[PDB]
Amino acid sequence: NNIRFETISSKYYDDVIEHLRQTFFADEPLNKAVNLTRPGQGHPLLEQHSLSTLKDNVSIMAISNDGDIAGVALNGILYGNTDIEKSREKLNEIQDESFKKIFKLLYEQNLKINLFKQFDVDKIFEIRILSVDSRFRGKGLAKKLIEKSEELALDRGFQVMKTDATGAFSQRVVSSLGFITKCEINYTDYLDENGEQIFVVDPPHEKLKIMCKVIN
């Protein structure tokens, strides 16, 4: 099209969450592996998290001439001084078994690195969701969304960006933009206390990679 990129404001939150319900949530490798939701259905915890993220006012949408959401990068701000009981309490608090499996894997992997210390920063710009509507694929929008995200991050004074990339496509995009893998795990190697694979994921997804880029 003539696609436009904009920071996502509150008037677009509903439109964005609907885009996710329709195009993203059920297709995400881990969500799909544990049958977290169904196409179009959404999920209260996923949506609560996405709304909280949106309110950080650093997310980007690609929007078409007729105002359709072509794609989004939902980005959040992580602080180095955030309490370390925060996550491990919620891990205990969740009633959704499947969601808890996902939360647990991401928490565990994040324990293995400390980017705040590694790069001496008090805040990090986190790419949380990268999503492009099938109608709009092949236009390079995923990569452009991350490029615009970096532009905004730099403008807002960030020096480090981070993403916990669960899928192969987003991994390829961020790799192509200079992100480096700091931590990784193969889904086939991640087993429960009873010995079976916790996430059986569809090809081409193979690994969870925690990836980062120094931008300033």
Short mmCIF file of N, CA and C in Angstrom, two decimals, residues 35-112:
data_model
loop_
_atom_site.label_atom_id
_atom_site.label_comp_id
_atom_site.label_asym_id
_atom_site.label_seq_id
_atom_site.Cartn_x
_atom_site.Cartn_y
_atom_site.Cartn_z
N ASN A 35 -2.24 -25.42 23.43
CA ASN A 35 -3.66 -25.18 23.17
C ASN A 35 -4.21 -24.07 24.06
N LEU A 36 -3.48 -22.98 24.16
CA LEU A 36 -3.85 -21.90 25.07
C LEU A 36 -5.16 -21.25 24.66
N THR A 37 -5.36 -21.10 23.36
CA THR A 37 -6.55 -20.44 22.85
C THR A 37 -6.85 -20.92 21.44
N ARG A 38 -7.86 -20.34 20.82
CA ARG A 38 -8.31 -20.76 19.51
C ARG A 38 -8.30 -19.54 18.62
N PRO A 39 -8.18 -19.73 17.31
CA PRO A 39 -8.16 -18.54 16.46
C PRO A 39 -9.38 -17.65 16.70
N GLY A 40 -9.14 -16.36 16.93
CA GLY A 40 -10.21 -15.38 17.08
C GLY A 40 -10.75 -15.25 18.49
N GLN A 41 -10.40 -16.19 19.35
CA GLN A 41 -11.02 -16.29 20.67
C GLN A 41 -10.39 -15.39 21.73
N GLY A 42 -9.08 -15.23 21.66
CA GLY A 42 -8.37 -14.44 22.65
C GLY A 42 -8.18 -15.18 23.96
N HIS A 43 -7.78 -14.44 24.99
CA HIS A 43 -7.48 -15.04 26.27
C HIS A 43 -7.34 -13.90 27.27
N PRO A 44 -7.98 -14.03 28.45
CA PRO A 44 -7.95 -12.88 29.36
C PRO A 44 -6.55 -12.47 29.80
N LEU A 45 -5.66 -13.42 30.09
CA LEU A 45 -4.32 -13.08 30.55
C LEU A 45 -3.46 -12.51 29.42
N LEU A 46 -3.55 -13.11 28.24
CA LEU A 46 -2.82 -12.58 27.08
C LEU A 46 -3.22 -11.15 26.80
N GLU A 47 -4.52 -10.88 26.85
CA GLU A 47 -5.02 -9.54 26.54
C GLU A 47 -4.69 -8.54 27.63
N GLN A 48 -4.78 -8.96 28.89
CA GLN A 48 -4.35 -8.12 30.01
C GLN A 48 -2.88 -7.71 29.85
N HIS A 49 -2.04 -8.68 29.48
CA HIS A 49 -0.61 -8.42 29.30
C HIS A 49 -0.36 -7.47 28.13
N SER A 50 -1.02 -7.72 27.00
CA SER A 50 -0.88 -6.84 25.83
C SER A 50 -1.36 -5.42 26.10
N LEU A 51 -2.44 -5.28 26.85
CA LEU A 51 -2.91 -3.93 27.18
C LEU A 51 -1.91 -3.21 28.07
N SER A 52 -1.41 -3.91 29.09
CA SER A 52 -0.38 -3.33 29.94
C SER A 52 0.82 -2.88 29.11
N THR A 53 1.24 -3.73 28.19
CA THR A 53 2.36 -3.39 27.32
C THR A 53 2.08 -2.14 26.47
N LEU A 54 0.90 -2.12 25.85
CA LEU A 54 0.48 -0.99 25.03
C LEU A 54 0.58 0.32 25.80
N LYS A 55 0.21 0.30 27.07
CA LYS A 55 0.24 1.54 27.85
C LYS A 55 1.64 2.11 28.12
N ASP A 56 2.69 1.35 27.82
CA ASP A 56 4.05 1.90 27.87
C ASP A 56 4.33 2.92 26.76
N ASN A 57 3.40 3.02 25.81
CA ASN A 57 3.43 4.04 24.78
C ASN A 57 4.67 3.96 23.89
N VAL A 58 5.16 2.75 23.66
CA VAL A 58 6.32 2.56 22.77
C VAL A 58 6.07 1.50 21.71
N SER A 59 4.80 1.11 21.52
CA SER A 59 4.47 0.13 20.50
C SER A 59 4.23 0.80 19.15
N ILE A 60 4.49 0.07 18.06
CA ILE A 60 4.34 0.62 16.71
C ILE A 60 3.30 -0.19 15.93
N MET A 61 2.44 0.48 15.18
CA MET A 61 1.56 -0.18 14.23
C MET A 61 1.89 0.25 12.80
N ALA A 62 1.72 -0.71 11.90
CA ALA A 62 1.65 -0.46 10.48
C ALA A 62 0.18 -0.46 10.13
N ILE A 63 -0.25 0.68 9.60
CA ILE A 63 -1.66 0.91 9.32
C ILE A 63 -1.85 1.32 7.85
N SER A 64 -2.84 0.73 7.20
CA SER A 64 -3.04 0.94 5.77
C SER A 64 -3.82 2.21 5.48
N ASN A 65 -3.96 2.54 4.20
CA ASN A 65 -4.68 3.75 3.77
C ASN A 65 -6.12 3.80 4.26
N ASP A 66 -6.75 2.64 4.37
CA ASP A 66 -8.13 2.58 4.85
C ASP A 66 -8.22 2.35 6.36
N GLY A 67 -7.08 2.49 7.04
CA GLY A 67 -7.04 2.44 8.50
C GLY A 67 -6.99 1.05 9.12
N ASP A 68 -6.78 0.02 8.31
CA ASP A 68 -6.63 -1.35 8.81
C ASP A 68 -5.27 -1.57 9.45
N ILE A 69 -5.24 -2.33 10.55
CA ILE A 69 -3.99 -2.73 11.17
C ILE A 69 -3.33 -3.77 10.27
N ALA A 70 -2.22 -3.40 9.65
CA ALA A 70 -1.48 -4.34 8.81
C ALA A 70 -0.54 -5.16 9.67
N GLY A 71 -0.01 -4.53 10.71
CA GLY A 71 0.86 -5.31 11.60
C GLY A 71 1.22 -4.50 12.83
N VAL A 72 1.78 -5.14 13.85
CA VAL A 72 2.23 -4.41 15.04
C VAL A 72 3.53 -4.96 15.62
N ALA A 73 4.23 -4.08 16.34
CA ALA A 73 5.29 -4.47 17.25
C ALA A 73 4.88 -3.95 18.62
N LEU A 74 4.49 -4.86 19.51
CA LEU A 74 4.15 -4.44 20.87
C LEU A 74 5.44 -4.51 21.66
N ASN A 75 5.80 -3.36 22.23
CA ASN A 75 7.06 -3.17 22.93
C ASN A 75 6.81 -2.68 24.34
N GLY A 76 7.59 -3.20 25.28
CA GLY A 76 7.47 -2.78 26.67
C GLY A 76 8.77 -2.28 27.25
N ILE A 77 8.69 -1.62 28.40
CA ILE A 77 9.89 -1.12 29.06
C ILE A 77 10.20 -1.95 30.30
N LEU A 78 11.40 -2.53 30.34
CA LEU A 78 11.87 -3.28 31.50
C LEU A 78 12.80 -2.42 32.34
N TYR A 79 12.57 -2.39 33.65
CA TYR A 79 13.45 -1.66 34.55
C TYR A 79 14.36 -2.56 35.39
N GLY A 80 15.61 -2.14 35.55
CA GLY A 80 16.58 -2.88 36.33
C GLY A 80 16.25 -2.93 37.81
N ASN A 81 15.47 -1.96 38.29
CA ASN A 81 15.15 -1.90 39.71
C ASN A 81 13.82 -2.56 40.08
N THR A 82 13.21 -3.23 39.10
CA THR A 82 11.99 -3.99 39.33
C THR A 82 12.24 -5.15 40.28
N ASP A 83 11.42 -5.24 41.32
CA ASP A 83 11.55 -6.26 42.36
C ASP A 83 11.56 -7.69 41.80
N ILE A 84 12.32 -8.56 42.47
CA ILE A 84 12.57 -9.92 42.00
C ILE A 84 11.63 -10.94 42.67
N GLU A 85 10.57 -10.43 43.30
CA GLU A 85 9.47 -11.26 43.77
C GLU A 85 8.33 -11.14 42.78
N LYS A 86 8.38 -10.08 41.97
CA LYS A 86 7.32 -9.74 41.04
C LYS A 86 6.82 -10.94 40.24
N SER A 87 7.71 -11.53 39.46
CA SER A 87 7.34 -12.63 38.58
C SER A 87 7.01 -13.90 39.35
N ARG A 88 7.91 -14.32 40.24
CA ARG A 88 7.76 -15.60 40.93
C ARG A 88 6.50 -15.69 41.80
N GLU A 89 5.83 -14.56 42.03
CA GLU A 89 4.56 -14.55 42.75
C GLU A 89 3.44 -14.90 41.78
N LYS A 90 3.44 -14.22 40.64
CA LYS A 90 2.47 -14.48 39.58
C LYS A 90 2.57 -15.93 39.10
N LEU A 91 3.79 -16.43 38.95
CA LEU A 91 4.00 -17.83 38.57
C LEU A 91 3.17 -18.71 39.50
N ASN A 92 3.19 -18.41 40.79
CA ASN A 92 2.38 -19.13 41.77
C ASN A 92 0.89 -18.86 41.63
N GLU A 93 0.54 -17.67 41.14
CA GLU A 93 -0.84 -17.19 41.17
C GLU A 93 -1.76 -17.65 40.02
N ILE A 94 -1.19 -18.16 38.93
CA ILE A 94 -1.97 -18.45 37.73
C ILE A 94 -2.80 -19.75 37.81
N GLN A 95 -4.08 -19.67 37.44
CA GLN A 95 -4.94 -20.86 37.40
C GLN A 95 -4.95 -21.57 36.05
N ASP A 96 -4.42 -20.89 35.03
CA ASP A 96 -4.35 -21.46 33.70
C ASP A 96 -3.06 -22.27 33.61
N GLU A 97 -3.18 -23.59 33.70
CA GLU A 97 -2.05 -24.52 33.60
C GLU A 97 -1.11 -24.23 32.43
N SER A 98 -1.71 -24.06 31.26
CA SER A 98 -0.96 -23.87 30.01
C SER A 98 -0.16 -22.56 30.05
N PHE A 99 -0.87 -21.50 30.44
CA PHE A 99 -0.22 -20.21 30.56
C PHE A 99 0.95 -20.31 31.52
N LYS A 100 0.75 -20.99 32.64
CA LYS A 100 1.82 -21.14 33.62
C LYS A 100 3.05 -21.85 33.03
N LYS A 101 2.83 -22.84 32.17
CA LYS A 101 3.97 -23.50 31.50
C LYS A 101 4.80 -22.48 30.71
N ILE A 102 4.10 -21.64 29.96
CA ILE A 102 4.79 -20.61 29.17
C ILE A 102 5.54 -19.59 30.05
N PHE A 103 4.81 -19.03 31.02
CA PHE A 103 5.41 -18.07 31.94
C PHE A 103 6.67 -18.65 32.59
N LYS A 104 6.57 -19.89 33.06
CA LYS A 104 7.67 -20.57 33.71
C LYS A 104 8.89 -20.71 32.81
N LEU A 105 8.69 -21.15 31.57
CA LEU A 105 9.84 -21.28 30.68
C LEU A 105 10.54 -19.93 30.49
N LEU A 106 9.74 -18.89 30.23
CA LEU A 106 10.36 -17.58 29.97
C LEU A 106 11.08 -17.03 31.21
N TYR A 107 10.46 -17.18 32.38
CA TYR A 107 11.10 -16.79 33.64
C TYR A 107 12.44 -17.51 33.87
N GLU A 108 12.40 -18.82 33.72
CA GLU A 108 13.58 -19.64 33.92
C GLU A 108 14.71 -19.24 32.99
N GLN A 109 14.40 -19.02 31.72
CA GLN A 109 15.47 -18.70 30.79
C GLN A 109 16.03 -17.32 31.11
N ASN A 110 15.15 -16.39 31.47
CA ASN A 110 15.61 -15.05 31.84
C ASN A 110 16.50 -15.00 33.08
N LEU A 111 16.38 -16.00 33.95
CA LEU A 111 17.32 -16.08 35.09
C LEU A 111 18.78 -16.31 34.71
N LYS A 112 19.04 -16.73 33.48
CA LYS A 112 20.37 -17.19 33.12
C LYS A 112 21.25 -16.07 32.59
#
